[PDB]
Symmetry: C3
Subunit: 114 residues, 3 copies
Amino acid sequence: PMFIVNTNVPRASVPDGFLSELTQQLAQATGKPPQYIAVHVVPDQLMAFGGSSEPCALCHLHSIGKIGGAQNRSYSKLLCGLLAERLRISPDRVYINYHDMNAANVGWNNSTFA
Amino acid sequence: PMFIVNTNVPRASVPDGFLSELTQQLAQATGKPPQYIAVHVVPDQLMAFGGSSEPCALCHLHSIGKIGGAQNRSYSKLLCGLLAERLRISPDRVYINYHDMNAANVGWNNSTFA
Amino acid sequence: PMFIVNTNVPRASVPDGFLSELTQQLAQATGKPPQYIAVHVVPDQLMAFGGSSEPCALCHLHSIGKIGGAQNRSYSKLLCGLLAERLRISPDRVYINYHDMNAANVGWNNSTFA
């Protein structure tokens, strides 16, 4: 899995430990080994949500499998909860796009996962 | 819907009001309410288009529906026009990727849009 | 085609000439003219891979065709090789997502590629 969060929250408001927390919680939610989880946080962005520059987050989760209606609801509750608790972003100002990647379309370690 | 523009144009060259203009124009183009439109502009990037570094833009539009051949031509005319007028980016140095998202694959407000 | 590399490697560690080298190597690999290749490098990012903040890269290649099992293996060896040689990133700390775009879903120059 690969997770990115783009946010207008400033860098100083991203707490120490946040990447590690994202890694751990995504491993557990997806079932994937922690070694395969990559996370990326991009603060200080020029963004708006509904026209407003109040705190918001625009995100993507790419995964080989483990994407589907029920799973994605669970991920959204998890990830919105973390963004609310840690970055003080309202859940209704978060979008997360879920992308089910075929293994042949993910490169890693000089090859692909097919 | 959510829209990102990655550009090498400097931040000071992004005019005041630009995020709002994008929000408004995308609401009208997609037909979705402005409350549901999110926009993200990433200036000052290290980029090349066709081997050169004049102003350029690499973009993505993620929408739940409202993506298709004729719609996308109209969005491209609209968005290239805005990037030309406001950021002085030639239309032949813009790529926009259109992504039709399923509602179950978009998280928001602790759940999905399904 | 367009390629993005997000990395925690600092900007000063990105060699002069890297954008041009990516352009040329991707033109050759995809078989597309260099004029149609766009590249975007994003250093200094807050990211982790497997929980670790050692050097890593998270990448995307969007192409209208020229995406498939064997092609993507070849791209991954090429790109991991460049990231190792030029940015000193371990291949096993690189993900590259390959996205085969429909021509009608790519805007350019006021229209689409359809």
